[PDB]
Automatic annotation (TrEMBL), chain B:
This is Protease Lon-related BREX system protein BrxL. The gene is brxL. It comes from the Bacteria. The chain holds residues 5 to 97 of 679 of the full protein.
Length: 673, 93
């Protein structure tokens, strides 16, 4: 707690000396300052020595004085130029880029805010700070003016120049620091590094925050997040990163985003590491092929414009506001109804490597903002930029294999997300099996959410939504659920719905939903969601064979051989795979073929063999308690299970309208009423 | 006969056979067209020994990592040429 917080503070001060700061004092400066945050971070890093309150306050005064004295208002820009000429030299704060004028063989610096485009700068200054040549950095500069009649070069020259961003990166020291800290400490420090209070947030919210950071470390890593307003979705992309841009409104022309043929220049996707489209509800491209180019880039990581194919490593993020409830949106078009109708296309959403459930995050509240030490924002951004160069998606093959529900796109998405999480938490490359376990579970879950939404859009083509991973040692196949979405309704549903309860492979009582869809066919049986279990498929085959055998007794004329049945198993409690499914499968077939809705709020128990011999309900009391918890009002039981009724609690038993059948056909008759 | 096919192609189409599956191992991640990697592995294949194949594959990965000319740093590369007089880069000419 507090002791842990303090010891983390000395750890940060030790291993990250000169790269950490009490981030609370930063919001004491931000309000009256136009300068980007990371520049303030670097300046306070330079002007603060220790934790003496007098030292802190005097350093804050010094920083404010520096910013007030040496900032250049854009409108005031011209004024500054004259001040350079009259005084010979003048000190300014500005963002400087540099280009090599090969015609004059000289280095020209461009001051973006000041308006100078070709100020002469010496080769030594260029060689000292190579970051000037990449995207330009915020520096304190000493402009000098020197004009001789007939000269052709720019008369503005730069004599002294000091960066106001982290000029160089030492990731060896960063690896040392990470190795010197625990995984929990590293994650908590990362959460602090964006200014949030680690102790005030749950673990799940921390993992979703890390998922927010992921696009900064994986190339071409798309992601979509919709949520309630005020959760700070856009804070990270707009203020806390010099390597990200928040395109406002979503309205952008393909010439600006991707490639301008007239200028023969690449667009945003070649300039920034992260491109975040705010409030996606307003996305609409003037040219209809714009969505085509977006689809191509997101699918392949490169796009062809005219005759040239060009690659780009920009990671696209789509943030949006949700104006409905979480559940109400689930019964809307799917979840991404907020997305524009022009972007509602199955092939488009198939590219999203991740959905982030922005709704679960609590709304931002001032007590969620940390006041403790955290890494300088610029240091974190440089860390992300460097980490973009590595690869860790191969870590899963060391311990786990992917399931068979995952096509190549799902495989690519899960590998990318696993790699991103792995880089964020374990840059040093030393890790165990359980860490990869957690990361892989998270990646599978977030990809599965997109899979569910795309299935809801597209129907059948994207049916394999039961993503799972297989251990290499125990060979145990662990299945991952959407949890949030995967939370007995009311009234009879259409034929093919039923809710059953049974002991999973772990021996725990759990609830499952059976889904049957019947079409015109030739008596063929299809199965889905059975955890790929050979046993469960065997009981389904048993039930189908028995239903075919006794079709006359139940259907009264309906032909099994003229219709095809497809069954689906949905686990609503994540207890584990169920083998006892013969009788519920039979009742499913009966309801679907006859077109009769099952009785509302009835749970069928027990099982049967191939010959129709009914088996007693194992864990009858626990199953009844589970039925009561889920909202069951009626229960169907085998007659032989009645011998275990005296073992049932009185209060539990009085809650149900209890039905006892004799054989599976009588179970059908009880179920269908 | 498959090995005989490989022999015949090496005899008549020398330097044109690349042992497809290997290039998939490099689809882990890069910024280079697939056929470029195919030609590189074709030159660095040397023989069919798995150890030699793995070593040349590592050399190819290192070569691609060392000399990439990622567009945002392109201007910086110019300075490296201007300061050092000469610099080796991989690019489309």
């Amino acid at each position: 707690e507090s002791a842990n917080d303090k010891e983390l503070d000395q750890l940060l001060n030790e291993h990250f000396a000169g790269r950490v700061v009490r981030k609370d004092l930063t919001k004491l400066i931000k309000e009256g300052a136009n300068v980007p945050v990371y520049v303030l971070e670097y300046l306070l890093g330079m002007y603060c020595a220790s934790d003496d309150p007098e030292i802190i306050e005097q350093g804050l005064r010094n920083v404010k004085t520096v910013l007030a004295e040496n900032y250049v208002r854009p409108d005031e820009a011209e004024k500054v130029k004259s001040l350079v000429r009259e005084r010979g030299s003048y000190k300014v704060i500005d963002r400087v880029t540099v280009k090599l004028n090969e015609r004059k063989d000289k280095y020209e610096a461009s001051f973006s805010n000041l308006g100078i485009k070709d100020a002469e700068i010496s080769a030594g200054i260029v060689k000292e700070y190579e970051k000037l040549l990449v995207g330009g950095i915020w520096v304190i500069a000493t402009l000098s003016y020197y004009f001789e009649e007939g000269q052709t070069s720019s008369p503005f020259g730069v004599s002294l120049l000091k960066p106001i961003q982290m000029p160089n990166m030492n990731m060896d020291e960063l690896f040392s620091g990470r190795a010197a800290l625990s995984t929990d400490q590293w994650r908590e420090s990362l959460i602090r590094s964006i200014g949030m209070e680690p102790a005030s947030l749950k673990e799940d919210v921390q993992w979703h925050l890390l998922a927010r950071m992921v696009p900064f470390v994986e190339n071409n890593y798309n992601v979509c997040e919709l949520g309630p307003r005020g959760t700070g979705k856009s804070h990270i992309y707009k203020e806390c990163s010099p390597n990200s841009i928040l395109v406002s409104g979503g309205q952008t022309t393909v010439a600006n985003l991707f490639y301008n043929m007239s200028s023969r220049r690449i667009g945003l996707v070649g300039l920034w590491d992260v491109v975040a489209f705010d409030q996606v509800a307003g996305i609409s491209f003037k040219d209809k092929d714009g969505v085509q180019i977006m689809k191509d880039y997101m699918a392949s990581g490169s796009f062809a414009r005219g005759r040239e194919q060009m690659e780009a490593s920009a990671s696209m993020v789509f943030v949006g506001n949700i104006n409905q409830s979480v559940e109400s949106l689930v019964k809307t078009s799917h979840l991404l109804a907020p997305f524009p109708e022009a972007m509602i296309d199955s092939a488009f959403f198939d590219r999203f490597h991740a959905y982030i459930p922005g709704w679960e995050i609590p709304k931002m509240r001032p007590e969620f903002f940390t006041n403790r030490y955290g890494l300088i924002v610029d240091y974190l951004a440089e860390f992300f930029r460097e980490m973009r160069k590595r690869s860790f998606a191969d870590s899963i093959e060391k311990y786990f294999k992917l399931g068979n529900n995952l096509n190549q796109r799902d495989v690519i998405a899960v590998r990318k997300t696993v790699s991103g999480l792995m880089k964020l938490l374990y840059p040093h490359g030393q890790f165990n099996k359980e860490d990869v376990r957690q990361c892989l579970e998270y990646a599978l879950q977030v990809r599965r959410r997109v899979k569910e939404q795309l299935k809801k859009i597209g129907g059948m083509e994207f049916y394999d939504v039961h993503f799972s991973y297989i251990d290499n040692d125990t060979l145990e196949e662990h299945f991952v659920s959407v949890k949030e979405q995967g939370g007995i309704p009311e009234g009879p549903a259409k034929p093919g719905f039923l809710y059953t309860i049974g002991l999973s492979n772990k021996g725990m009582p759990g609830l499952y939903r059976l889904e049957l869809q019947v079409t015109k066919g030739s008596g063929k049986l299809a199965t889905s969601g059975l955890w790929n279990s050979s046993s469960a498929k065997e009981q389904v085959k048993i039930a189908f064979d028995y239903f075919k055998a006794n079709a006359s007794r139940i259907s009264g004329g309906s032909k099994v051989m003229e219709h095809d049945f497809h069954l689906h198993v949905v686990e609503l409690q994540n207890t584990g795979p169920l083998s006892h499914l013969a009788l519920p499968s039979l009742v499913a077939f009966a309801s679907g073929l006859l077109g009769r809705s099952v009785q509302s709020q009835m749970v069928v128990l027990g099982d049967m063999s191939l010959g129709g011999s009914v088996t007693p309900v194992e864990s009858i009391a626990e199953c009844l308690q589970v039925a009561f918890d889920a909202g069951a009002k009626k229960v169907a039981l085998p007659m032989s299970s009645a011998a275990d009724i005296p073992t049932i609690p009185v209060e539990l038993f009085t809650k149900f309208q209890t039905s006892f059948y004799a054989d599976p056909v009588d179970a059908v008759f009880k179920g269908l009423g």
